[PDB]
Subunit: 254 residues, 3 copies
């Protein structure tokens, strides 16, 4: 039997809003350490890696490890039926082919109860080579969202250039070029930009895919980009006090 | 000569939004007792019944019993031209084939008047019986809207089961099935159940989500159910009249 | 080398929102007096004239006059990359075929730096003959915008009746007709400089393009006369104006 209770229901709503369009179907690896998802996008280019640690749940109890195949688009629609301040509880038996989802209200006079059919999936977990990185920019998620959206109307590709003073995002297409430049900051609040830099890095990335990652933006005030040459970029969102949601993306070659 | 003058113009705007895409043509029944409207939707599944009593207007006056037919799309387009705290005066003079709408702003600087054309309609007054029902459930309207909206993700129909403890809503479809449950309370956000016998009926959410366009008119809604008879979703237009929606259960 | 620095960048974002759908391509006249743009619309019905005097730029330099052709849609997309509180700075070289724009966040350590392509353009500069007007109305920009938006549902053309008491807007179509009548006189204040009474007809389709300029000003002026086009002026305060000229029906 599996039964994880989560008081911040919104966390789960937000995660599935991020992923549903990027990935159609995925295998939710449950264990006593918690919930994990790892999958490539429909078009096999970006890797996604969710970690919800069991510590982070109010109540958690998994006995056997599960490998629940889920249509995320389906799971998303059901999470719409939860309010943002609802307490959510997931639950499952081994020889049932159904994840159950229970939404308790904050007024506490309403209780929703859904049952989501699962599916059988053909999933490998790839090796994410756990690394140290040349550059690691930590900045506001809203700002990075802005930068990625704005440059989409200039070009298809962004060149991230990382140095000690700051980071630069650049793009080129049919109507000109553009050049966004952020510097390190602060003594002011958590709208702060910071860099832990070992070597300079310059890498080109697909803006189409980065704009898919930024659907995660409402999880976290801040976002960490980690880079090194000839290895994937890691856009990371802390699901604070619980885990993270990481998008991996390889740069372009020439 | 007809002339009603409503201070809460908003009430008139809200009613037209609740109707205009459920119904494209209907006959307004004007009288000394107030304004009534009875109609069925474009495709004959649901029956709407409006009531706005003469007492509920500021000024009220009706010489004869007019029956003006109105393209509701065109009328809603005119009520777009009125602000929310505007004062709406309806007026029809003798044998002109047109309804006038006058808008006066709360500041009173701006004054706007509109001449809408009428159309000839085929009036069969299906005056369905004033029944008394097995279960009568009284609950927040916005809560009722959320429930109908959500369960559409799940399926095409909603099963409304009723009891003394609480009302229950259920739906099934391709992706799985769902089951929302409202328990009874001990004043404005209160949930209450006048239950003679237990009920369990099944309705098309498509139509329920047309009814809930009427949710601006009231903080609460009263659902009325009985076996093999039509459901009544009633938004009160408080101290003024009501707006009832009728819908039959499924095969 | 030209270089104009505007602290209220938003002005420029708003100007291009008010123009991009009405005119696709346009020629910007850069001189020591400021920035001017005069051009006819897509379908050759209405004239637009923009002025931004050099005084209103917090820094301004122009060593030689310029005629930059600009695809206003392209430019509208580049300006979308600027925050409402950014300091925008236009800049052009001796004789390059690019305009450089520079967006600086007022405080927060962010400079965006764009470079837009230009294009060759033979446009006919039409001299605007300065006229005396019979009526000139001053009303709230947002109320004129509300009116042309509302009457759009009733008919395709609006009749503007200007008396000393107030000003009347009317429209007729299939579904019916409507009148909106405004008195004379606070912030929302209608006020009329009346010489001779006027009543003229105008395409609402074009008015509702002009009113996209509404974010530039709390007030808007209408200036009418018979056998001569309507002037819808939006003041870009302490700087210049955006004027739309439109000829009437019949």
């Amino acid at each position: 039997m599996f039964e994880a209770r989560l008081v911040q229901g919104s966390i789960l709503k937000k995660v599935l809003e991020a992923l549903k369009d990027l990935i159609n179907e995925a295998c939710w690896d449950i264990s006593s350490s918690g919930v994990n998802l790892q999958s490539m996008d429909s078009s096999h280019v970006s890797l996604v890696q969710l970690t919800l640690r069991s510590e982070g749940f109010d109540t958690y109890r998994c006995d056997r490890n599960l490998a629940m195949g889920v249509n995320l688009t389906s799971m998303s629609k059901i999470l719409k039926c939860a309010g943002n301040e609802d307490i959510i509880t997931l639950r499952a038996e081994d020889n049932a082919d159904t994840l159950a989802l229970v939404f308790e209200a904050p007024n506490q006079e309403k209780v929703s109860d859904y049952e989501m059919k699962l599916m059988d999936l053909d999933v490998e977990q790839l090796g994410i080579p756990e690394q140290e990185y040349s550059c690691v920019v930590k900045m506001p998620s809203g700002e990075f969202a802005r930068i990625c959206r704005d440059l989409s109307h200039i070009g298809d590709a962004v060149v991230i250039s990382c140095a000690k003073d700051g980071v630069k995002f650049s793009a080129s297409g049919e109507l000109g070029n553009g050049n966004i430049k952020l510097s390190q900051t602060s003594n002011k609040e958590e709208e702060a930009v910071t860099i832990e830099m070992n070597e300079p890095v310059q890498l080109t990335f697909a803006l189409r895919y980065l704009n898919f990652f930024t659907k995660a933006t409402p999880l976290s005030s801040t976002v960490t980009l980690s880079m090194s040459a000839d290895v994937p970029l890691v856009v990371e969102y802390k699901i604070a006090d619980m885990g993270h949601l990481k998008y991996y993306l390889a740069p372009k070659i020439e």
